[PDB]
Amino acid sequence: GAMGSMERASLIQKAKLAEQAERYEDMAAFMKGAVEKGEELSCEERNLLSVAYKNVVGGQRAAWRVLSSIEQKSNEEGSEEKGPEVREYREKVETELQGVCDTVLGLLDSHLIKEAGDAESRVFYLKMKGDYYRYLAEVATGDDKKRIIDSARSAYQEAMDISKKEMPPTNPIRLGLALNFSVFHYEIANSPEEAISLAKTTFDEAMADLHTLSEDSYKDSTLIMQLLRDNLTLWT
Amino acid sequence: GAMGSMERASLIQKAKLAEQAERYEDMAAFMKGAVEKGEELSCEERNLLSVAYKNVVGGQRAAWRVLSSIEQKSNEEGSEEKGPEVREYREKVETELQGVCDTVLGLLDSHLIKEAGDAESRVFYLKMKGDYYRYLAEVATGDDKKRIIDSARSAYQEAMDISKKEMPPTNPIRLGLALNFSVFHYEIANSPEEAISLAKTTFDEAMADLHTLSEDSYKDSTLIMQLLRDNLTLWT
Amino acid sequence: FPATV
Amino acid sequence: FPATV
Ligand SMILES: N=C(N)c1cc(-c2ccccc2)c(NC2CCCCC2)s1
Ligand SMILES: N=C(N)c1cc(-c2ccccc2)c(NC2CCCCC2)s1
Ligand SMILES: [Mg+2]
Ligand SMILES: [Mg+2]
Ligand SMILES: [Mg+2]
Ligand SMILES: [Mg+2]
Ligand SMILES: [Mg+2]
Ligand SMILES: [Mg+2]
Fold this sequence. Notes:
heterotetramer, A: mainly alpha, Delta-Endotoxin, domain 1, 9 helices, about 0% strand, globular, C: little secondary structure, binds 5-(cyclohexylamino)-4-phenyl-thiophene-2-carboximidamide, binds magnesium ion, protein kinase C inhibitor activity (chains A, B), protein kinase binding (chains A, B)
């Protein structure tokens, strides 16, 4: 643990500084160090962790897609052989991406999930587990592809089951979980109808519960509801 | 040399792929490996090298400025002591930035400059030497600050002297050199009048030589001339 | 690509 | 900041 000698509070402070400086790799390393202190994470700390790794893996995914597109065009009919380099570099980025996913899943399994008893923490971490298995699934091609997909599905389903029993339909964690599980159905599981049904039902149940909210909670919930509607517009 | 086992041509190809994927740290590592093959660089290869490291150090500089601003506010009057963390993290980013500059200067001194005999290569590398000493100067605070500043000045001056003798006043390398040396005068040497005079004279001498150019050369030169004018507008 | 958070 | 290339 390269961060083992730094105070937990100092790691959290430096994660916040790294965020302001748009140094997301640093932010992720700081938050990994904080997790490895072994204490549970507060709500703010959980979101620092997720923001950091989402930005890191997001850049990797964007790069992988560029390289995968180039590689597919280099293997088309009539294309000129450019050598192993495109595949090699796509593989390099892919391996680094898988490594980030393995790291995040590792933090969740040792030992964030098993200590998370409140719905807002447990649903948050199970959503993250689904998300990072989904990123593995985006690049998976071999014997374990179906098991990787099912690992994502299983995590998202447990998170959904808890969220429906323990959170109001406008809870932003519940909403973001449903948004992302819907995308899993559409893009990973080849289940566009399930994706569309989930997005619609989530939006409608949230709409019916907005009346209970303060102005600030309303803003948080309607922001994610607009993303559900954006996806529905893309898909219908 | 982590890239010692990869073919030169494969390193160049992967640098181009990394650029398309906006993976500038990878692009820089590939181009460092290419330089370390020991052969001179073509024009395209020189620009791949400069693009890669400019993006890397540019991100570092942007982060350093954010952190330096936070640090200065934390040391103001009436501010609440937040501990050593802001300084420590600013120092971490600063040390990484200095390391990138030391790496680029190292490539220029071993052995790109000494083998560069044509004006377009030699002026290009001496401009880079001035640029990376300037980035060191931006963060320098101790006994060697004046020597770092003078190292930048000396490199830029040699590049200017060659460029005036060997290149037309519209040459885009000559123009970019003058743009950046002007910024050195303004921001590093505390010589705003020299900065303004250099930008004006460079712009006017370029304007008078545009008539000699093709449409494509005209576009390249006028793009940089607009940056000279933008700086003059900022400064007057 | 579709929106996720 | 001023422009450089
Ligand atoms: N540095 C940050 N990026 C965050 C900090 C916080 C936060 C701050 C204080 C208390 C709880 C959470 C965040 N929250 C989430 C969840 C609630 C809606 C806004 C996004 S993102
Ligand atoms: N990948 C690239 N970013 C580049 C590739 C090249 C280049 C390509 C072919 C021949 C010479 C240079 C570049 N040139 C410079 C200097 C001339 C004006 C444009 C910017 S930037
Ligand atoms: Mg302690
Ligand atoms: Mg692979
Ligand atoms: Mg259902
Ligand atoms: Mg060879
Ligand atoms: Mg220092
Ligand atoms: Mg003069």
